[PDB]
Amino acid sequence: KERDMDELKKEVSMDDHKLSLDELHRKYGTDLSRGLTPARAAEILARDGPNALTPPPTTPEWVKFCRQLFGGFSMLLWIGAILCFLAYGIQAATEEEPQNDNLYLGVVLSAVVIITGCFSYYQEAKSSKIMESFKNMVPQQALVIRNGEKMSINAEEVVVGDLVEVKGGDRIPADLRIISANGCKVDNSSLTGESEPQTRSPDFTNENPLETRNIAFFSTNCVEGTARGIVVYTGDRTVMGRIATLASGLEGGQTPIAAEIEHFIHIITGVAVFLGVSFFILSLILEYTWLEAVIFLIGIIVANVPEGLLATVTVCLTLTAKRMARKNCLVKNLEAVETLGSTSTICSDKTGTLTQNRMTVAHMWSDNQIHEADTTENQSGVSFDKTSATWLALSRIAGLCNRAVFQANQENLPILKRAVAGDASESALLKCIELCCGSVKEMRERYTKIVEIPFNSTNKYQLSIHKNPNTAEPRHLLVMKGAPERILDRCSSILIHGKEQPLDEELKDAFQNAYLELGGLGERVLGFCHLFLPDEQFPEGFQFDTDDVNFPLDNLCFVGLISMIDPPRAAVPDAVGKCRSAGIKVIMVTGDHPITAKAIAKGVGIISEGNETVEDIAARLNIPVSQVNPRDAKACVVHGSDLKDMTSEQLDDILKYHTEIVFARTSPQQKLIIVEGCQRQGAIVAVTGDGVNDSPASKKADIGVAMGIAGSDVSKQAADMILLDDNFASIVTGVEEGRLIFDNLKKSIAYTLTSNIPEITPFLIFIIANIPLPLGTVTILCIDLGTDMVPAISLAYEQAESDIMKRQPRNPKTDKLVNEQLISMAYGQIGMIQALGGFFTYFVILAENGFLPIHLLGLRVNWDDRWINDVEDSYGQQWTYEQRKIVEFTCHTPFFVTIVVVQWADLVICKTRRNSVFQQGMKNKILIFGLFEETALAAFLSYCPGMGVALRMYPLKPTWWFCAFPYSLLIFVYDEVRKLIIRRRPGGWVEKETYY
Amino acid sequence: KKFIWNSEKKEFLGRTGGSWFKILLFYVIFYGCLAGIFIGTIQVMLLTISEFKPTYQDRVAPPGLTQIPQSQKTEISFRPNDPQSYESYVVSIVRFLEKYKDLAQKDDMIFEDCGNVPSELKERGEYNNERGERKVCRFRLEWLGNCSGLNDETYGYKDGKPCVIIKLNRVLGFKPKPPKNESLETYPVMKYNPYVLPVHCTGKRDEDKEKVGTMEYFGLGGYPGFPLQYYPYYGKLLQPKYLQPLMAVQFTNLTMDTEIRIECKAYGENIGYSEKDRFQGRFDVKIEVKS
Numbered sequence A: 001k002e003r004d005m006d007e008l009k010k011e012v013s014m015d016d017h018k019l020s021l022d023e024l025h026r027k028y029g030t031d032l033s034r035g036l037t038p039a040r041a042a043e044i045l046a047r048d049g050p051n052a053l054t055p056p057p058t059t060p061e062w063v064k065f066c067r068q069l070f071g072g073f074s075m076l077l078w079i080g081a082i083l084c085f086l087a088y089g090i091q092a093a094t095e096e097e098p099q100n101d102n103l104y105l106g107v108v109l110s111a112v113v114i115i116t117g118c119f120s121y122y123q124e125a126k127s128s129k130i131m132e133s134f135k136n137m138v139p140q141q142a143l144v145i146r147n148g149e150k151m152s153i154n155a156e157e158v159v160v161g162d163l164v165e166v167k168g169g170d171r172i173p174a175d176l177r178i179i180s181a182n183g184c185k186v187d188n189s190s191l192t193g194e195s196e197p198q199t200r201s202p203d204f205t206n207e208n209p210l211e212t213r214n215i216a217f218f219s220t221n222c223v224e225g226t227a228r229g230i231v232v233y234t235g236d237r238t239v240m241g242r243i244a245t246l247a248s249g250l251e252g253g254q255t256p257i258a259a260e261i262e263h264f265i266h267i268i269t270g271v272a273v274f275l276g277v278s279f280f281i282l283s284l285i286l287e288y289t290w291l292e293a294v295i296f297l298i299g300i301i302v303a304n305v306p307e308g309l310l311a312t313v314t315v316c317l318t319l320t321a322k323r324m325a326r327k328n329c330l331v332k333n334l335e336a337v338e339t340l341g342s343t344s345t346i347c348s349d350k351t352g353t354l355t356q357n358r359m360t361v362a363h364m365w366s367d368n369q370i371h372e373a374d375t376t377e378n379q380s381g382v383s384f385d386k387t388s389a390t391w392l393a394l395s396r397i398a399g400l401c402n403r404a405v406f407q408a409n410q411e412n413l414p415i416l417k418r419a420v421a422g423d424a425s426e427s428a429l430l431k432c433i434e435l436c437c438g439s440v441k442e443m444r445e446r447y448t449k450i451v452e453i454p455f456n457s458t459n460k461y462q463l464s465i466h467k468n469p470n471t472a473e474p475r476h477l478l479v480m481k482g483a484p485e486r487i488l489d490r491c492s493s494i495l496i497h498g499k500e501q502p503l504d505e506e507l508k509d510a511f512q513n514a515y516l517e518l519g520g521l522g523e524r525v526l527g528f529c530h531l532f533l534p535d536e537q538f539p540e541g542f543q544f545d546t547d548d549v550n551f552p553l554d555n556l557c558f559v560g561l562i563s564m565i566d567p568p569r570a571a572v573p574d575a576v577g578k579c580r581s582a583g584i585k586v587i588m589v590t591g592d593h594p595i596t597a598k599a600i601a602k603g604v605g606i607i608s609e610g611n612e613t614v615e616d617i618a619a620r621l622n623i624p625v626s627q628v629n630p631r632d633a634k635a636c637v638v639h640g641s642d643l644k645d646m647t648s649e650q651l652d653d654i655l656k657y658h659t660e661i662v663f664a665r666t667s668p669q670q671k672l673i674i675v676e677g678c679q680r681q682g683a684i685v686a687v688t689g690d691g692v693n694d695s696p697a698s699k700k701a702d703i704g705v706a707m708g709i710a711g712s713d714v715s716k717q718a719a720d721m722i723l724l725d726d727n728f729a730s731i732v733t734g735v736e737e738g739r740l741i742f743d744n745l746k747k748s749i750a751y752t753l754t755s756n757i758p759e760i761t762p763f764l765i766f767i768i769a770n771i772p773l774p775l776g777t778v779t780i781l782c783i784d785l786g787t788d789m790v791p792a793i794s795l796a797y798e799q800a801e802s803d804i805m806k807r808q809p810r811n812p813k814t815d816k817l818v819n820e821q822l823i824s825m826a827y828g829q830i831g832m833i834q835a836l837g838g839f840f841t842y843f844v845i846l847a848e849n850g851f852l853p854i855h856l857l858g859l860r861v862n863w864d865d866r867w868i869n870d871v872e873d874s875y876g877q878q879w880t881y882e883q884r885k886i887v888e889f890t891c892h893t894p895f896f897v898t899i900v901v902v903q904w905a906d907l908v909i910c911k912t913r914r915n916s917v918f919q920q921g922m923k924n925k926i927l928i929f930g931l932f933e934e935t936a937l938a939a940f941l942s943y944c945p946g947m948g949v950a951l952r953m954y955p956l957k958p959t960w961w962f963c964a965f966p967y968s969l970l971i972f973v974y975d976e977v978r979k980l981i982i983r984r985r986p987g988g989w990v991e992k993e994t995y996y
Numbered sequence B: 001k002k003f004i005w006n007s008e009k010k011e012f013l014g015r016t017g018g019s020w021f022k023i024l025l026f027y028v029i030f031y032g033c034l035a036g037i038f039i040g041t042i043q044v045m046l047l048t049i050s051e052f053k054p055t056y057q058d059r060v061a062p063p064g065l066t067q068i069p070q071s072q073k074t075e076i077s078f079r080p081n082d083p084q085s086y087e088s089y090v091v092s093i094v095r096f097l098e099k100y101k102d103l104a105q106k107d108d109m110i111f112e113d114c115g116n117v118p119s120e121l122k123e124r125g126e127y128n129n130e131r132g133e134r135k136v137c138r139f140r141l142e143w144l145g146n147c148s149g150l151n152d153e154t155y156g157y158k159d160g161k162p163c164v165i166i167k168l169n170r171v172l173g174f175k176p177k178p179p180k181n182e183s184l185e186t187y188p189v190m191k192y193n194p195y196v197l198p199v200h201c202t203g204k205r206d207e208d209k210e211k212v213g214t215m216e217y218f219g220l221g222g223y224p225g226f227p228l229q230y231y232p233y234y235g236k237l238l239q240p241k242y243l244q245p246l247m248a249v250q251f252t253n254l255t256m257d258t259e260i261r262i263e264c265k266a267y268g269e270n271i272g273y274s275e276k277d278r279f280q281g282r283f284d285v286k287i288e289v290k291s
């Protein structure tokens, strides 16, 4: 009945929050401030279990082995192996002293899969192995007060209906309700993507359970301030755990790569059955025994199966992944590497994924002008001019007004990436000085405070007053930082270029105008004013008041405004544009407030400047929102509240008729629905997330991605891709590789396939015309799995033919990995030439030892007999069984060689799909090496001592090597002119068939 | 999924008729061009090889040693009474010998009587078609001594104590050499040495040697040897129906109804053997006459 359990998990969260203080007690029967009794606690711990999420079921290592031993491509090979033995069994009884060739094929076939499997599992292990190396997380002790005895207990030991003091810097133990508060704010970013900390209040605020400040959430922490409260949901009952449980119990979906294999498999067998069935027909028409005929069908179908291709594909896939791992892009699953290239549409999260989840100084206003501080994580951004003294008179206020400082432990850690206590807003201010205006540590002590003012709920303002060490004017100085509206009331003078100036109304409008603009931007706005406190009218020494207000509140000297927001990552904007360039759809999904979101997409390229949201049109005309038609707005914003009352059909409409699109105030569940809605189009969609809110989407995504450090661990596991460096630009690199590997696989696939036509061909005519067998089964193995592999692997290293980034996303129902076209080029034409050359060589040898082609017809029968030893040739000599067999073996060996010679050209032509040989050039060093590896190997295979004994492969007379040279050269000629013919002809029939 | 055959476009098996034809023409032309090339390459290869001689003879350097009654396993098993039992073995002996009577050996030019005595090898010119169709040396059935003897010996052969004969593989230009005068390796059953090629047979193992009481070989000159004069065979085409020299052996006080094994070994300098080809100048046989 789990489909219901899943469905209940899919539903948006429901909870009860609004009620009398007394009523919470009337439900859970715990004294509001007295805590509880131990006996009460013990009963519940059995009732619901401990306060921890249930671990995801461990998967035994041995089980995985079988997965790669089965899969899809591996399964195809197996039946072959099996069908060797089933064939061999039939063969064993019927034949007398049967040849052991078929049996050998089967063992090797199974071994290849077992190796391939073993190799694969080594890598997929190594990821989750090293993935555990950064999964070194730590338990955190719970802070608990029971029966008023203030007894802290272990987090697992936590139980329902209990009291808790959430002091600053302590992680929230479990989802709880609030009874008392002193401005504690919490990071709900992980659960609901709130970039700004939201203050916590006991009173009810909003219907949505997530929004109301009365409740609390797991995997969050009280940053500043303190509060207390009482338990509601614990352990699995916790919203996050439910969310995780949901994610882990979902369907990873079929990855696009392996699906192309499954279609690829269909075509392979599809020609095989037709070829085999046709041959079986012809074989019976040829009068050979039924039992023998079956063997023939099996042999053709079996030998038609690719052998080493499985290994070539696997090795090629791994290599591409390695470079990603070189640049801290790790994939737990090997198959997913290609997914990035295949993606037609993306959905990313705002905070933690694009944002650094740190409040940070954004813009500054001094001397009636704006100065956007460099928002860069790595400090690569441009900087404002600091020449004006107003910067100094401004910077000092921040450095001193701020309450705290950096932790001592941080040493060579970069200024931006170092932890600090207290409000983040204060931190960013401490930061901005530390980069731009020297240091603060000395600067903080160099001006000695006397009295400071902490945050006050009533009459809110925040100020201090320190001494002036600079000898010019010993009079003490007072600094006040506050919200602009309150600050406006308390200041008259303004410092421009070091001269105090009064509050002209026009300047007052400008400050108000600036405040409005920054608010639209969404950065929190803070204003700073400082006025020198004279020493003639007020004693230079001890003259202070704390209860009755002494110092001049009003008529201070204002300096400027500083704005704070969570910027994107340094490389994020450029990457977004690059993706858009490939025609990929870019969409932002977050649970954050619309105000912050809209600007982000404008600044990062999701929203092109000048495109209008449905609302902007209303504002442009001062008209009700309803009137304008939605089509006019190329982009659209969608608040989460509306989404709840929305039907799958409407989404479809919302998607197609727009491009730039952003949702906000969205539940994690709601995110998942978006992905499915994108999927319902039948397109390939990817997902990037930071917090637990993103865990469900990544899983159900074709491929999920997250950040290595700034990410939530639950989501980390669900994703198929982990970015260790947290370099968003890596995604751009990924798509590049994905499109790149795709094409090179097309190339690789063709090389090994073309080989099968000459591989199989002799076996065929051998039955049809009863001639001596032109090619040994063993020798085939030396091609499929011996010489050819090293080129097949080398092909993957091929560089880009053209700027793939320009290319639009392929369509999965259109440009499939292996079309009918490819078969025609390799199996249909090149292969036939590839094979033809071998037969020519075969005929040459036999003739050169007096066995004339015309005379070789029907010769098989007497040939393979082990007792007739006076076999006559056209020249008329008589031959013993072993000799003429040695010749056949020594005739098999050139066939193997010629195959390499002929394959040489294929390696070259399949290096390019469109460009001329030298248009791309032979720059692939590995390709080159293989040429020699393949050659040297082949040569050795024939000239080592006793190869004709161990492998029945004899040395080669020197002329034979150049036998097929015209043929190979001809193959080169045909393909080059063909690829160069489609260069000139953009849309010619040439393209529709030959191009693959 | 079975809509590929026809559609609104009516593409046949998913391909338009016009394209279907276009592919066919190109494919046909391409296949035709391919075939023409291959054949032309083959035509060249023909011209490389002269009709008279083979270009590589390395693999026949140790020549073969075939029997006459080629058997499925070099084994002869039959009833000395039942014709059907021994019919298969005997059947070939005649159809083989069919081209050996004085009837075929009639045209004087084609057949020249080498003689009734082994002589120096009859070198016949230097191989070319410039010299005419060369001559063949005659071979009489009567040289077989009371084996296939017609008037003198029964056609039965396999009635009891069957005869078996050994044929050396014909090799172009092969010049047989007499065994070394040094006789350390030469078991001298035959006195004649200069113009005869020695042939001897022996049991496979010491126990086998005991089993076979005696064997008698009958040949031209009353020697177990091939005629040196006959060789060198000069071309099957060059000498149509050239007759191979034939040598035979027979057995005496053998052990009937018991499988026994016999080895026939050719001797001479220009003869090799291999532990991997039992027929490579060597010879084995299993024989059982069950009554």
Ligand SMILES: *[C@@]1(O)O[C@H](CO)[C@@H](O[C@@]2(O)O[C@H](CO)[C@@H](O)[C@H](O)[C@H]2NC(C)=O)[C@H](O)[C@H]1NC(C)=O
Pocket: B145, B146, B147, B153, B216, B218
């Ligand atoms: C030839 O094969 O067979 C005849 C018998 O058919 C042999 O001439 C007996 O058989 O042999 C001895 C001499 O060996 C004579 O005294 C008898 O008269 C023979 N009887 C008959 C009926 O002929 C002859 O030995 C044999 N020739 C050879 C070469 O083996």
Ligand SMILES: CC(C)CCC[C@@H](C)[C@H]1CC[C@H]2[C@@H]3CC=C4C[C@@H](O)CC[C@]4(C)[C@H]3CC[C@]12C
Pocket: A844, A959, A960, A962, A963, A964, A965, A966, B041, B044, B045, B048
């Ligand atoms: C026009 C050029 C490019 C090539 C045309 C192909 C023809 C004319 C030539 C080129 C290479 C040649 C072959 C290469 C090698 C051998 C093996 C040798 O033991 C006999 C000659 C033989 C069999 C040659 C036959 C003729 C041949 C097939």
Ligand SMILES: *[C@@]1(O)O[C@H](CO)[C@@H](O)[C@H](O)[C@H]1NC(C)=O
Pocket: B181, B193, B194
């Ligand atoms: C032979 O070599 O040796 C014989 C002595 O036992 C001798 O009678 C015979 O004529 C010799 N023949 C030749 C050709 O050497």
Ligand SMILES: *[C@@]1(O)O[C@H](CO)[C@@H](O)[C@H](O)[C@H]1NC(C)=O
Pocket: B213, B253
């Ligand atoms: C025969 O070969 O062997 C007999 C022993 O089994 C023996 O009595 C008899 O004399 C032998 N016959 C001949 C002709 O040698």
Ligand code: BEF
Pocket: A189, A192, A193, A194, A349, A350, A351, A352, A589, A590, A591, A592, A690, A691, A693
């Ligand atoms: F802002 Be995201 F949803 F974390």
Ligand SMILES: [Mg+2]
Pocket: A193, A349, A350, A351, A352, A353, A689, A690, A691
């Ligand atoms: Mg986020």
Ligand SMILES: [Mg+2]
Pocket: A252, A698, A699, A701, A702, A703, A704, A718, A719, A720
């Ligand atoms: Mg996945």
Ligand SMILES: [Mg+2]
Pocket: A303, A304, A305, A306, A307, A755, A756, A759, A784
């Ligand atoms: Mg193959």
